[PDB]
Amino acid sequence: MKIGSGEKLLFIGDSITDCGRARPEGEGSFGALGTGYVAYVVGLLQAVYPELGIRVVNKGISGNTVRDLKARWEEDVIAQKPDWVSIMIGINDVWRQYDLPFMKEKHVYLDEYEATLRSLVLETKPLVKGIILMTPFYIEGNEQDPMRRTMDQYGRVVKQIAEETNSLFVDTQAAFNEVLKTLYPAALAWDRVHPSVAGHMILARAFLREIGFEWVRSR
Amino acid sequence: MKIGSGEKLLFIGDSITDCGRARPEGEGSFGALGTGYVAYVVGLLQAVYPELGIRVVNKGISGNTVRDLKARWEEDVIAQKPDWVSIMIGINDVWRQYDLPFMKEKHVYLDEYEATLRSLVLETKPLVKGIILMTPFYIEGNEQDPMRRTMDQYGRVVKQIAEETNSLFVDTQAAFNEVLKTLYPAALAWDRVHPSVAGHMILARAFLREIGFEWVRSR
Amino acid sequence: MKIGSGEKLLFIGDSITDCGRARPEGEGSFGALGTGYVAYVVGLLQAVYPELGIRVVNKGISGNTVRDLKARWEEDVIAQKPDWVSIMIGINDVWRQYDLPFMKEKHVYLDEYEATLRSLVLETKPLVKGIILMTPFYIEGNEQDPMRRTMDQYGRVVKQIAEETNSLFVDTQAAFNEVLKTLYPAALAWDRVHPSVAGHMILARAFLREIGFEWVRSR
Amino acid sequence: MKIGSGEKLLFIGDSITDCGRARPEGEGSFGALGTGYVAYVVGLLQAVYPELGIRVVNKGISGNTVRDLKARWEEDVIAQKPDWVSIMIGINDVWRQYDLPFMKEKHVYLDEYEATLRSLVLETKPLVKGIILMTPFYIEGNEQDPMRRTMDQYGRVVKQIAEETNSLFVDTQAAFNEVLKTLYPAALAWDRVHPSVAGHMILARAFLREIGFEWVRSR
Amino acid sequence: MKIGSGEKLLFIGDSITDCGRARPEGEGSFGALGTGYVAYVVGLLQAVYPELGIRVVNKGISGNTVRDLKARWEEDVIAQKPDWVSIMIGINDVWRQYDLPFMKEKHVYLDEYEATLRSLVLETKPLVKGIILMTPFYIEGNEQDPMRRTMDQYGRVVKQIAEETNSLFVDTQAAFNEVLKTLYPAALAWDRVHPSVAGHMILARAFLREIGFEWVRSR
Amino acid sequence: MKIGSGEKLLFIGDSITDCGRARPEGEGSFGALGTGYVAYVVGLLQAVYPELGIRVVNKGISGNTVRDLKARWEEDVIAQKPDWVSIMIGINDVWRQYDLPFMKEKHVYLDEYEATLRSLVLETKPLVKGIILMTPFYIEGNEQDPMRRTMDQYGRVVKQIAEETNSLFVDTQAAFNEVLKTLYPAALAWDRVHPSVAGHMILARAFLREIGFEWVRSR
Amino acid sequence: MKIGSGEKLLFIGDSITDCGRARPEGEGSFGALGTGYVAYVVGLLQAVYPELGIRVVNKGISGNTVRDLKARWEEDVIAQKPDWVSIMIGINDVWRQYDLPFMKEKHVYLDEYEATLRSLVLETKPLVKGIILMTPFYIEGNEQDPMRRTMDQYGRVVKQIAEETNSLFVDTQAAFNEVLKTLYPAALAWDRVHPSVAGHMILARAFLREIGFEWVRSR
Amino acid sequence: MKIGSGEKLLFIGDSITDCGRARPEGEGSFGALGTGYVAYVVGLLQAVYPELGIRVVNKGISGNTVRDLKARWEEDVIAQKPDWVSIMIGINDVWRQYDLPFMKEKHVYLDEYEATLRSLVLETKPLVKGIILMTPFYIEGNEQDPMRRTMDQYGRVVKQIAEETNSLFVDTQAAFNEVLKTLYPAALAWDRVHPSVAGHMILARAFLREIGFEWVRSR
Ligand SMILES: [Cl-]
Ligand SMILES: [Cl-]
Ligand SMILES: [Cl-]
Ligand SMILES: [Cl-]
Ligand SMILES: [Cl-]
Ligand SMILES: [Cl-]
Ligand SMILES: [Cl-]
Ligand SMILES: [Cl-]
Ligand SMILES: [Cl-]
Ligand SMILES: [Cl-]
Ligand SMILES: [Cl-]
Ligand SMILES: [Cl-]
Ligand SMILES: [Cl-]
Ligand SMILES: [Cl-]
Ligand SMILES: [Cl-]
Ligand SMILES: [Cl-]
């Protein structure tokens, strides 16, 4: 378990991270974390590692791109003095290109995305114990569907950044891809983005595996 | 125009037809028709052929398969004594196979679909002046996406029942396919099924074209 | 088609233009345009000309007169940098004279209306590709009903302005008048102002015809 | 005053009568009567003739035609054992001909109107102390507007049934016509049917005048 | 009729005047006047004197005493430039003494009430055509019930002020007292203050009589 | 204490008893009892005699007269098998005579009141361990107010049925009369019937005193 | 009775004091006091000592610790110029330690609690007639349950402060403890903090006993 | 994994099972399962064993005891034809003894509990592929708290019915007891029964462990 006793873990991202969390503070055991993967992660950490006393904060905001993250980074991340920061962003940066193809100011293209994401990591890194970069995803098994193919470009950039900055790394697309050998997307998400509890459990599990959670502790 | 003065035109189908129509009656100029293609059809007929005096009833019900249509056919179609019946059914018959793959009782497989749709068309045809069979559709441009491929098969059944029964036929998939040469599905429908006003306009236009509507009357 | 690829078309007016559009921005494919003629225009443009990529903004506000338009023109029109501006105003300028005949400050009489409308057109014209002036209307077929007779005076002023300024011109009253050879007003609008889908389709069609939309493209 | 001490006065009709009255009972001093002319009548009677002890019941139902009155007459009129019955019906009988011209089953044409109203009056008359027939009306000053012209015909039927049955008679059209020499319809009722408090006062005053109310008692 | 053509009549007071009027403006034919005596007055004036074109504004605020009136007098009265001002205040000034007898700051005793009311009249008088002073009231027929006896003291002060300032005068208590020879208070108002439509009609009639309204005009 | 360990105490009456109790059951510690004197009684019993283990059911129904109690007596009283029944009824029996003086069917005059209450008490008495008859009341200190005077008569009937049947008796009027030497009615109840928490405490205290509650147990 | 005629008694605390009181003022006979012990105290004082005319203000705020009280003390206590101040605080100071054991900034430990509480008392004492210190409580009968054991430490500090400052003292825990010889906590409060009416009556009674209330006055 | 491909797993119990599941059906991927352990189980199965194709139905109903389960067993369990039935019941059977100690009909004492649960298990076992008996629980670490001690006894009954019937068994108390070595109950559940997401994760994990789930499959 990478995360130590008494440390503060902060999640940031878009609607997938937000999932109705309390604004602004995003912190608490009784519903403030929202109803998705972040809450599940916290639940599993308290169920299996209750004695760690890890404080968890949810700073997800629905609709955000990486441009949006940068605009609130000082208040929502730096000022919280976290020990660990998890980032999942990119879905909207890409989705806008495809759902509102002529509203170009809503789009964040790959080279802006890469430099902005890198800027967040590099600002943050000297201030925390660690960073977890989670790729964006698209719940679509055809690698050549245009949005899937784009998403994969963004996920490859995240991986490159994590390698270069010695951050932890969660490939969410790879997690979905395993399940998509069996299920058509619509069984997880009608819209291919916002999933069922199952999808959120896919995400929470992928995150926990990368931080060295054990389902039943050797300890 | 195939449809003539004083005739009662009754539309039946699933959510795409329903669009929040008034239940049970589904009839009237002031919101009873719902907010999608059926209303748009009636509006355009009224704007361009006000003198036709067509009465239009919306018997769409969200969620329905053709098995559900059969269960209400007597009270919602035959008892309304329509002159013209327009049917668009099949989306849910297919979609349940993909979004609830393990709840097999909710699926209506091709054998049940064909037999049932066929039976409804045959029973109805001698009772009315005319039938219009509209294909189901899936807003997805890849013919080898599994659900698109299934939907195309269901739509071949509809085409061949229309041909056999000398019913009018509207190929709604082909109408979307044209726009899909330009737009990614998400620009019309996040979930590839329930579209924007533009999608309902694609549907209304396809219907009207098949019934010989003229945008500006030749006269 | 007068409107070119990539251009921004902005509609302004009263409740007939507003129809519940999102405030303040009024822009988007999924409901921000409201539920009336503006949305229908956009729907038909995307259904038939998806590749044009025309951005459309709805700046209608319920209750407005031309005095009101002038008060928000800089923020709601100039600052949007549109390529095309469509204006429909006058209904309230006139209606107040008849529904609140003793609340005179709510009235905008014809000579103020004419000069104010002209001022908007002349301010705007050097900044855009084109202007579309749509007359106000009253859904009443008796030319000598007092409100109808007044409305027609205002529509004649709009026509004169469009001719003088080389704007495009939509005679909405003439569009209604054709339909009113068959229908009593109440079949379109109980209040003779706010119509059914059919009325909105009358308007959308009238607008599209003036910009050279084709229902089925020669192209 | 035609109406005397301890008598039960029952009003029946459509929305103009209903005005949100309590269902099913329609009786009582504290809001059960609704918010229009029936309540205003009861208030004025109470203010000026408190000692009369008149009981008043509102059996108005929004949307009704005379065909609807007949269907509920037994339970809503005869079973209430009133002394005096006031009827105002006909607006919807007419209005449906004009606002839903093609839904002919919703229309109640003059033959059905006369026969039915006549039958109700004849059946009721021997069971009660008195009947008051109030004309329907249309807030429109042009006698040749098609709906006004129809409404005037229906009102001639009412007048002649009242004369034949020696019922009291209230010419509500004539009461509006007087105000319409000054006001355009929209100042009283946007839709020419459901008026402001002023319109309900015109109705209440016309009723009271016919029953011999005095604003200040001669005594 | 004291009130002339084109003049502005403004009502001010407490909840009895307010009756849910629109804030802040309190002016309009379609519900802004609230649902009580003020609206009824306007209704009767439009029904019988439509050609007068009298503008009416409702500045009632629930809970107010005369202290409260003075605090908003410049914005709610002076700044409206009325021709006629009607005042009804005192009910709360008195009621608080009896319902919250130990919350003394809510009480306005008679000598403060008299001087404050006089100050409003004297400030206003040089700016208007006329003032109408309506007494407060308490719907209680025992002159020796403590609250009734107090209320009567306040009404006598209003009468004295009206005489001294040559204002018009409405004795609302005397109007109620006539009806209370027949009805127990609870038939008009459970709380002895907020009445039925009948009570509001008592008030509206009392006001109209003092301004020389005729129910049927000699004119 | 008259009431003993393990006994079921059932309260019945009108709004004063109901106070928003859960329907149909009316039983339980956590809000089912409503928010007035019945709940206050149960709370005080629990605070001071927790060991008594009294079960308490609230069968109050807003609006009821004794005629309504009779109509539900079998299912709401006898079928509950109580040990002790507390009745407080009469307010509405009286109040309808005064607030709806002309709706005579809603009145329950003294002959019906006495006969009915008497019959209920006689039928119930052999089936239970004990009955407590609480007078109705009117929060009004003037014995010659007409409704107070009637209520006092109804309360004499209750007292004399209690004496005859050796039932416990609570004179609720006398409990209010004591406070009314100090407070005007409006300080307890604007409408002289439905009081503040203080009024419900006056009722609860009167009940408890009659059943031999001690505020601090003598032990 | 310690509290004299005309004096102002102010309660402050957490949710147990707040119980939905009106913000900000917290004062009035008709619901502003909330629905718990404070209201009950006022009810009993008005039922038994109506002539005292004691004004009572509720300044409870849900969630508060003693740190929170100190932050609003000047506006919510000093500025009200009370004669008597009752304080009940500590429940949250303790509860947070146990429900959110890793959100340490929400905790108020005993030595901070003691000094802060003392500071409030000492600031206040020269400005009032008297202070009533009510212990916090936990509805749990096992003295060695960790939260109960902590709560008792805080209650002992309150007692010490009251002794040192010559304040009045209410041991709420001792009151509960008597009832907990019979009832399991859940019969009073599922959460062991927020009780039924019974629990609130326990509190109100404990408070009244300490101020020398008599249930039936010797006087 | 004990549970195999294509099998229908039906969960039944009280609120802890229900968690807002869809009624009556309780089945489906998109929210029908509710928001607690049942949904979490289904999500984890889907994330880790998507190919198993397990159908899962939630028949939990808030408030139920085993007496309630028996009353609906035919329609909610047997008629669903499940392969696997998971039962968790007993919380309410116990809790009513403690929170409503005097409403003895609501209690289900150990004799009724054992007999009834036993009978259900015996009747069901020959009709299905397997049964999983989950203990009730109480989030309380003191074995001598009276309700914890009772709950432990009920849980011994469940264990011994499971052993006798060769049913799978989940000791949910033991799973909470482990976390309770660290956390006070209030950190998981204020009321010691309805827990946070962490509590539902403790339950889901205990279930999954008993059915041989692997967090990462050995393969
Ligand atoms: Cl929380
Ligand atoms: Cl999002
Ligand atoms: Cl409609
Ligand atoms: Cl559907
Ligand atoms: Cl949108
Ligand atoms: Cl408008
Ligand atoms: Cl009523
Ligand atoms: Cl109607
Ligand atoms: Cl208005
Ligand atoms: Cl008021
Ligand atoms: Cl309860
Ligand atoms: Cl009642
Ligand atoms: Cl209050
Ligand atoms: Cl709190
Ligand atoms: Cl679902
Ligand atoms: Cl439950």
Report CA(E23)–ligand 9 centroid distance (Å).
11
Using a CB-CB cut-off of 8 Å, the residues of chain F touching D55 are 102-103
Please report where in the chains the tokens 């949250």 appear, as a residue.
G92
Kindly list the distances between the CA atom of residue G102 and the CA atoms of A5, A8, A52, E150, G97, in Å, as whole numbers in the listed order.
10, 10, 9, 63, 8
D191 in active site:
yes
Q: Which residues are CB-neighbours of G184 under 8 A, at least 6 positions away?
A: H98, H99, H101, H146, H147
Per-residue HEC secondary structure of chain F comes to CCCCCCCEEEEEECHHHHCCCCCCCCECCCCCCCCCHHHHHHHHHHHHCHHHCCEEEECCCCCCCHHHHHHHHHHHCHHHCCCEEEEECCHHHHHHHHHCCCCHHHCCCHHHHHHHHHHHHHHHHHHCCEEEEECCCCCCCCCCCHHHHHHHHHHHHHHHHHHHHCCEEECHHHHHHHHCCCCCHHHCCCCCCCCCHHHHHHHHHHHHHHCCCCCCCCC
Using a CB-CB cut-off of 8 Å, the residues of chain B touching A99 are 184, 186-187, 190
Q: What are phi and psi of G87, to 5 degrees?
A: -120, 130
Q: Which two tokens stand for residue B46?
A: 């009224």
C-alpha A1/C-alpha A216 separation (Å) is 12
Kindly list the distances between the CA atom of residue E132 and the CA atoms of A180, E1, H109, in Å, as whole numbers in the listed order.
81, 13, 76
Q: Which two tokens stand for residue A121?
A: 């990591």
G218 in active site:
no
Of A5, A99, A191, A196, catalytic: A191
Q: Which two tokens stand for residue G97?
A: 């330690």
Q: Which two tokens stand for residue G128?
A: 């009032």
Report CA(C176)–ligand 9 centroid distance (Å).
29
Q: Which residues are CB-neighbours of B122 under 8 A, at least 6 positions away?
A: B165
Report CA(H195)–ligand 2 centroid distance (Å).
29
Residues 134-193 of G with CB under 8 A from F: 179, 181-183, 187
- Residue A159: burial class (beta carbons within 10 Å; 0-12, 13-18, 19+): middle
Amino acid identity of residue E173, one-letter, is: Q
What is the domain extent for residue D177?
A: 2-219
Q: Which positions of F are annotated as active-site residues?
A: 15, 191, 194
Task: Choose among E145, E187, E193: nearest Cβ to F142.
Answer: E145
Task: Using the Cα atoms of residue C204, residue C209, residue C212 and residue C218 in order, give the sign of their dihedral.
Answer: positive
If you write DSSP's letter for every residue of chain D in order, what string do you get? --S-TT-EEEEEESHHHHTT--TTT-B-SSSTT-SSHHHHHHHHHHHH-GGG--EEEE---TT--HHHHHHHHHHHTGGG--SEEEEE--HHHHHHHHHSTT-GGG---HHHHHHHHHHHHHHHGGGSSEEEEE--------TTSHHHHHHHHHHHHHHHHHHHHT-EEE-HHHHHHHHTTTS-GGGT-TTSSS--HHHHHHHHHHHHHHTT--SS---
Task: Using the Cα atoms of residue A163, residue A164, residue A167 and residue A173 in order, give the sign of their dihedral.
Answer: negative
Q: Touching check for H202 and chain A: CB below 8 Å?
A: yes
Q: What SS3 class is residue G139?
A: coil
Q: Which chains touch G (3 or more CB pairs under 8 A)?
A: A, E, F, H
Q: Within 10 Å of residue D23's Cβ, how many Cβ atoms?
A: 12
Task: Using the Cα atoms of residue B24, residue B29, residue B35 and residue B36 in order, give the sign of their dihedral.
Answer: positive
Q: Under an 8 A CB cutoff, do D102 and B6 touch?
A: yes
Q: In terms of Cα–Cα distance, which of F58, F49, F54 is closest to F10?
A: F58
Q: Tell me, what CATH number does B73's domain have?
A: 3.40.50.1110
Crossing angle of helices H197-210/H172-179, nearest 10°? 130
Q: Under an 8 A CB cutoff, do F182 and G50 touch?
A: yes
C-alpha G16/C-alpha G95 separation (Å) is 13
Using a CB-CB cut-off of 8 Å, the residues of chain G touching E100 are 28-29
Task: Using the Cα atoms of residue C24, residue C28, residue C33 and residue C38 in order, give the sign of their dihedral.
Answer: positive
> What letter does residue C4 receive in the DSSP assignment?
P
Sheet holding H55-58, edge to edge: H55-58, H8-13, H84-88, H130-134, H168-170
Which residue, among E100, E102, E103, E107, would best test binding to G if mutated, counting the most G CBs under 10 Å from its CB? E102
Q: Is the separation of the CB atoms in B91 and A173 below 8 Å?
A: no
Q: Touching check for G101 and chain H: CB below 8 Å?
A: yes
C-alpha G66/C-alpha G87 separation (Å) is 10
Residue of D nearest to B51 (CA): D102
Which residue, among G41, G180, G201, G215, would best test binding to F if mutated, counting the most F CBs under 10 Å from its CB? G201
Q: Which residues are CB-neighbours of D23 under 8 A, at least 6 positions away?
A: D61
Give the number of C-alpha atoms closer than 13 A to the C-alpha of residue E196, restricted to the C-beta side: 27
User: For chain F, how many residues are written?
Assistant: 219
C-alpha E196/C-alpha H28 separation (Å) is 54
Which residue, among G95, G96, G102, G105, would best test binding to A if mutated, counting the most A CBs under 10 Å from its CB? G102
Q: Kindly report the nearest CA distance between residue A147 and chain B, in angstroms.
A: 8
Kindly list the distances between the CA atom of residue D60 and the CA atoms of D70, D156, D210, G105, H199, in Å, as whole numbers in the listed order.
13, 22, 20, 64, 57
C-alpha B139/C-alpha B181 separation (Å) is 11
Of C5, C29, C191, C196, catalytic: C191
Which residue, among D29, D42, D46, would best test binding to F if mutated, counting the most F CBs under 10 Å from its CB? D29
Please report where in the chains the tokens 């497989």 appear, as a residue.
B109
Q: Kindly report the nearest CA distance between residue H95 and chain F, in angstroms.
A: 14
Angle at H166 between CA H163 and CA H170, to 5 degrees: 65
User: For chain B, how many residues are written?
Assistant: 219
C-alpha H152/C-alpha H146 separation (Å) is 10
Using a CB-CB cut-off of 8 Å, the residues of chain G touching A55 are 102-103
Q: Under an 8 A CB cutoff, do C53 and A103 touch?
A: no
Can you list the positions of beta strands (E) in E135-192?
Answer: 168-170
Residue of E nearest to D198 (CA): E43
Please report where in the chains the tokens 């338009």 appear, as a residue.
C69
Q: Is the separation of the CB atoms in G34 and G19 below 8 Å?
A: yes
Q: Is the separation of the CB atoms in B99 and B55 below 8 Å?
A: no
Crossing angle of helices A37-48/A197-210, nearest 10°? 50
D107 in active site:
no
Q: Touching check for E53 and chain C: CB below 8 Å?
A: yes
Q: H or E segment at H211?
A: none
Do G and B touch, 3+ Cβ pairs within 8 Å? The answer is no
If you write DSSP's letter for every residue of E15-55 in order, what string do you get? HHHHTT--TTT-B-SSSTT-SSHHHHHHHHHHHH-GGG--E
Domain tally for chain D? Answer: 1
Task: Note the Cα G19 to chain centre separation in Å.
Answer: 12
Using a CB-CB cut-off of 8 Å, the residues of chain G touching H180 are none
Task: Note the Cα B22 to chain centre separation in Å.
Answer: 17
C-alpha B148/C-alpha B180 separation (Å) is 13
C-alpha B115/C-alpha H103 separation (Å) is 59
Q: In terms of Cα–Cα distance, which of F39, F150, F133 is closest to F89?
A: F133
Report CA(B193)–ligand 13 centroid distance (Å).
54
Q: Which two tokens stand for residue G96?
A: 């947070």
Using a CB-CB cut-off of 8 Å, the residues of chain E touching F141 are none
Task: Using the Cα atoms of residue G9, residue G13, residue G16 and residue G20 in order, give the sign of their dihedral.
Answer: positive
How many contacts, defined by CB atoms under 8 Å, are there between A and G? 11
Q: H or E segment at A139?
A: none
Using a CB-CB cut-off of 8 Å, the residues of chain D touching C101 are 183-184, 187
Q: Is the separation of the CB atoms in D104 and D27 below 8 Å?
A: no
C-alpha C28/C-alpha H187 separation (Å) is 45
Report CA(D14)–ligand 8 centroid distance (Å).
4
Q: In terms of Cα–Cα distance, which of C179, C99, C207, C88 is closest to C137?
A: C88
Beta bridge partners of F131: F85
Do H and F touch, 3+ Cβ pairs within 8 Å? The answer is yes
Q: Within 10 Å of residue F180's Cβ, how many Cβ atoms?
A: 18
Residue of B nearest to D104 (CA): B55
Q: What SS3 class is residue C172?
A: helix
Q: Under an 8 A CB cutoff, do B35 and C40 touch?
A: no
C-alpha A67/C-alpha D97 separation (Å) is 59
Please report where in the chains the tokens 């409260």 appear, as a residue.
E68
Task: Note the Cα E107 to chain centre separation in Å.
Answer: 19
C-alpha C160/C-alpha C154 separation (Å) is 10
Using a CB-CB cut-off of 8 Å, the residues of chain C touching B29 are 187, 196, 198
Please report where in the chains the tokens 């790394």 appear, as a residue.
A169
Parallel, antiparallel or unpaired: strands D8-13 and G84-88: unpaired
Q: Is the separation of the CB atoms in E162 and E168 below 8 Å?
A: yes
Q: Is the separation of the CB atoms in A108 and A67 below 8 Å?
A: yes
Kindly list the distances between the CA atom of residue H30 and the CA atoms of A33, A189, B198, C48, D155, in Å, as whole numbers in the listed order.
20, 9, 28, 35, 59
Report CA(D33)–ligand 7 centroid distance (Å).
7
Q: Is the separation of the CB atoms in G98 and G68 below 8 Å?
A: no
If you write DSSP's letter for every residue of G177-215 in order, what string do you get? HHHTTTS-GGGT-TTSSS--HHHHHHHHHHHHHHTT--S
Q: In terms of Cα–Cα distance, which of D155, B106, E90 is closest to H25?
A: B106
Helices (H), H66-171: 66-76, 91-99, 110-124, 146-165
Q: What SS3 class is residue H109?
A: coil
